[PDB]
Paper text:
An epsilon-class glutathione-S-transferase in An. gambiae, GSTE2, and its orthologue in the dengue and yellow fever vector Aedes aegypti, have been linked to DDT resistance through elevated gene expression. Upon review of the crystal structure that was already resolved for GSTE2 from the susceptible Kisumu strain, it appeared that the alleles differed in codons proximal to the putative DDT-binding site, a hydrophobic pocket adjacent to the glutathione (GSH) binding site. Previously, Wang et al. proposed that a hydrophobic pocket in close proximity to the GSH binding site was the site of DDT binding.
Position 114 is also situated in close proximity to the predicted DDT binding pocket. In this case, a destabilizing polar hydroxyl group is introduced in a hydrophobic core region of the protein in ZAN/U, with the potential for marked effects on protein conformation. To better uNderstand the effect of this substitution in enzyme activation, we elucidated the structure of ZAN/U:GSH using X-ray crystallography. This suggests that this region, which constitutes the DDT pocket ‘cap’, has high intrinsic dynamics. Our data suggest that mutations can influence catalysis even when not resulting in detectable structural alterations, most likely by affecting the molecular dynamics of this region. The I114T change was predicted as strongly destabilising at 2.85 kcal/mol, while the F120L was classified as neutral at –0.98 kcal/mol. The importance of mutation I114T most likely arises from the creation of an enzyme with increased catalytic activity through predicted increased conformation dynamics and reduced product affinity, facilitating metabolic turnover.
Residue numbers in the entry:
A (entry chain A): 2 to 220
B (entry chain B): 2 to 221
Amino acid sequence: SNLVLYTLHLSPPCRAVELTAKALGLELEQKTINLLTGDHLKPEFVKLNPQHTIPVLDDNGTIITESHAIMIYLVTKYGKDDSLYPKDPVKQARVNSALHFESGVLFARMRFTFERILFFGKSDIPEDRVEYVQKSYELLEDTLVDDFVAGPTMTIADFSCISTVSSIMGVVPLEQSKHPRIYAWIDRLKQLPYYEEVNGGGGTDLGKFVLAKKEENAK
Amino acid sequence: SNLVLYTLHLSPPCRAVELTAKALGLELEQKTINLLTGDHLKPEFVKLNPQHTIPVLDDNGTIITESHAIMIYLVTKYGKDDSLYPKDPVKQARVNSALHFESGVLFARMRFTFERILFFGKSDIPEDRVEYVQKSYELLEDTLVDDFVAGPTMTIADFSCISTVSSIMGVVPLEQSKHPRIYAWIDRLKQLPYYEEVNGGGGTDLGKFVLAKKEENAKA
Ligand SMILES: N[C@@H](CCC(=O)N[C@@H](CS)C(=O)NCC(=O)O)C(=O)O
Ligand SMILES: N[C@@H](CCC(=O)N[C@@H](CS)C(=O)NCC(=O)O)C(=O)O
């Protein structure tokens, strides 16, 4: 059977996989898991992922969870070149470091900001969580010593970072005066023909969704 | 020359790498970076890692940052076999999933709790902070369908998870009634001959260090 991705386009790590699929020329059949209606908490999905998160990949019965693991798996198995995820231990390590930076810092602090508005119905953002996001921006800025997060070549680490950054920057302002490297890096990824369709809209929408929910939770 | 690790024994991701080295029979020449005195904010270290975090590996001139990347690098580079990090894409994926669960959920929420006490002079642990850690316990509990976090075999994903869990559980209590899988899993890792030296001491000490700092901060 087909390669299936259990996903939601609003979700940043889901968009990270979609970008990877596009960059690989892979065809992923998408099946929508509506987080908002609690589809991910249903027993049929929990069976696939006990952590009940998306994205989840179904590769002919073989279940793979977590976006970064999925991306690594996809490049390893279906990549016809290792540009997106090098075989060389040193270069691969630099990608892995950036990938874990994304999950450990960028994404984690993004959801530490979003879920209080999204899940707990609050209409504010505590400044300590704001600053934590701001510092993640700074850390990302410092990491971009080359054209891309994991070096001079675009890798899956860029897909993971841009999917999160394009979502959180719509809620916590990412100043161009303080983070010019990030904006230049965003502009490189925007030159990807499939960027806007896959991530552009989704990221802007999630960011707008949070802001919309924030205002709505205030009425 | 041997491998150089810019490290601190109290640090969970540092101990995860040290666990990996011991499992690989590698000798790590440690260079201590005291975060409390801001050694990691020094220009010479920032050059090594612009994110100014530990651990950082120096393999004969080659710099590798971030514990999980380092752990993968060590097994790939010096592993006599791949049991700690499989070459097989599927089993490898299960490990990677666990690794990113640790940094994305386990460690992140621990840092969300610890950092403000250790560095920002705070003395309280808000209940939403506690809640979120508790929720990480449940997620780990539900992930342990096998004896180890990424399957029947012990992998570097267990090293990453235990180093964080053994630190956070001393602060935010892990109740045995709700998490029997975690406790059994912890007992398995404690059977490793190098566990207490490499992680069992450091993990307990960090949790104790947080509580001590929390007490001292509260006393103005
Ligand atoms: N590190 C994981 C995080 C995935 C994740 O947290 N997804 C969110 C959507 S952005 C989710 O499924 N939330 C539902 C839940 O945690 O219960 C990955 O990249 O796959
Ligand atoms: N995902 C990273 C996290 C590393 C990390 O956050 N280390 C802490 C010590 S527990 C640190 O260096 N903090 C200093 C800082 O962030 O400025 C890894 O596992 O290497």
